């Protein structure tokens, strides 16, 4: 059926990891405005590793958002510690699903904000990370359970390949599963563009 209204943003079930990014207290929410994002196939863990392109974030001064498979350990803590400091305006979520589907489904968010997926294949490192592999978008919340990504800023025509490339996918899938599970994603896209 039709849906009846337009973009409410590329919504996945994934919640903030630390109560402390909460922004909006009065409804247990995290509102960044006009955020730049970072994606990472890895999960965060060491220090280390983030501290390059969280300075230069912090040089910028704009709001970030991380998706990794995890963040946990003291890169977490270094982020709670900052974030309440007010140094950086930092949230840091869990890459949605697991597998191939959740590595196609951080592909999914860099095209549509523009970003670059840190991988460990393609020669990149989080160290090395900078603010070109960084997405963007107008605005993003993220509750317990959510995370919305509104307005991407990816290009027009790489968001449309990717539904394209997507809809081939859903023509040669092989069950109703397979064929709703890519035809979310396909939703997930239009809704935040």
Same mark, same amino acid.
Request: glycine share 10%; no cysteine; charged share 30%.
């Given at each position: 059926?039709?849906?009846?209204?337009? *973009?409410?943003?590329?919504?996945?079930?994934?919640?903030?990891? *630390?109560?402390?990014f909460?922004?909006?207290?009065?409804?247990?929410?995290?509102?960044?405005? *006009?955020?730049?994002?970072?994606?990472?196939? &890895?999960?965060? *863990?060491?220090?280390?590793?983030?501290?390059?392109?969280?300075?230069?974030?912090?040089?910028?001064? &704009?709001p970030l958002?991380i $998706?990794?498979?995890?963040?946990?350990?003291?890169? #977490?803590?270094?982020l709670?510690?900052?974030t309440?400091?007010?140094?950086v305006k930092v949230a840091a979520? &869990?890459?949605?699903?697991?597998?191939?589907?959740?590595?196609?489904?951080?592909?999914?968010?860099?095209?549509?904000?523009?970003?670059?997926?840190?991988?460990?294949?393609?020669?990149?490192?989080?160290?090395?990370?900078?603010?070109?592999? #960084?997405?963007?978008?107008?605005?993003?919340?993220?509750?317990?359970?959510?995370?919305? $990504?509104?307005?991407?800023?990816?290009?027009?025509?790489?968001?449309?390949?990717?539904?394209?490339?997507?809809?081939?996918? $859903?023509?040669?899938?092989?069950?109703?599963?397979?064929?709703?599970?890519?035809?979310?994603?396909?939703? &997930? #896209?239009?809704?935040?563009?």
């Amino acid at each position: 059926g039709l849906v009846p209204r337009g *973009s409410e943003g590329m919504q996945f079930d994934r919640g903030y990891l *630390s109560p402390y990014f909460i922004n909006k207290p009065e409804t247990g929410e995290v509102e960044l405005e *006009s955020p730049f994002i970072l994606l990472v196939d &890895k999960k965060i *863990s060491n220090i280390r590793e983030l501290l390059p392109v969280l300075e230069a974030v912090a040089k910028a001064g &704009k709001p970030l958002l991380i $998706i990794a498979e995890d963040v946990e350990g003291e890169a #977490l803590a270094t982020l709670v510690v900052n974030t309440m400091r007010g140094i950086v305006k930092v949230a840091a979520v &869990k890459a949605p699903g697991f597998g191939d589907r959740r590595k196609a489904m951080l592909q999914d968010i860099a095209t549509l904000t523009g970003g670059t997926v840190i991988s460990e294949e393609l020669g990149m490192k989080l160290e090395k990370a900078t603010l070109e592999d #960084l997405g963007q978008a107008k605005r993003v919340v993220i509750t317990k359970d959510t995370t919305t $990504i509104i307005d991407g800023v990816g290009e027009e025509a790489a968001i449309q390949g990717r539904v394209a490339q997507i809809r081939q996918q $859903i023509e040669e899938a092989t069950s109703d599963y397979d064929r709703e599970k890519l035809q979310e994603r396909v939703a &997930k #896209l239009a809704g935040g563009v």
